Amino acid sequence: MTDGLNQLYNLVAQDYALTDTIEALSRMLHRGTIPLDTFVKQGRELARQQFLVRWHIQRITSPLS
Amino acid sequence: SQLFHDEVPLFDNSITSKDKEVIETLSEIYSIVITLDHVEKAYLKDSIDDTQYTNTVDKLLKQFKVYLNSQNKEEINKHFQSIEAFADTYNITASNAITRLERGIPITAEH
């Protein structure tokens, strides 16, 4: 597993994980564990991180310019 | 295999300081669209109430408009337009589509 190929695998891993974590936060909102404002702040952050991860993936897997 | 030999940076040498700003604003717009959708599913299955849903969505949409009408607005809207044109505009009726379009409301894939 090359260095770049390894990276790719983790980025992808991070994308899906980020979604899972957001969803989890949703259930915590539903179950009353956390309030709306908390979900919004945390969710936004994780989502922002997700875009960055994905865009990064696109750059790697692009016809390098 | 070999096509992916070395690890790549988030921002390589072909990226200017303006692009970075553009990308960051896009990440922020992304977060809002995603949050907007979760807040709605939340409301739909009674996790929050009418007011909560309403206050929240309003706050989000305002910040959203601000991302589309601030620094690097030119570049940002060019990206958004193509992004929206590519969106999966399905499960959303043409009826609802117009309402949203007049309201400046972005497309939020509801699955």
Partner: protein, 65 residues
């Protein structure tokens, strides 16, 4: 020879995976209350972690060959 191993390797890697998924939902059930940013911060960081490692092996496994 350098082929029989794979079978067992997949097996072991496939089991750690199921353990991570288990460790994943477990943590969620356990976290039945957040009384501080730290508490939530810890949850998010750990859930996100377990979840990433989960998908990593998850993708490393279905891509084994």
């Amino acid at each position: 020879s350098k082929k029989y191993g794979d079978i067992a390797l997949k097996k072991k890697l496939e089991q750690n995976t199921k353990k991570l998924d288990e460790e994943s939902s477990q943590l969620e059930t356990t976290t039945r209350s957040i009384d501080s940013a730290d508490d939530l911060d810890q949850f998010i960081k750990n859930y996100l972690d377990i979840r990433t490692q989960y998908h990593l092996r998850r993708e490393k496994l279905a891509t084994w060959d």
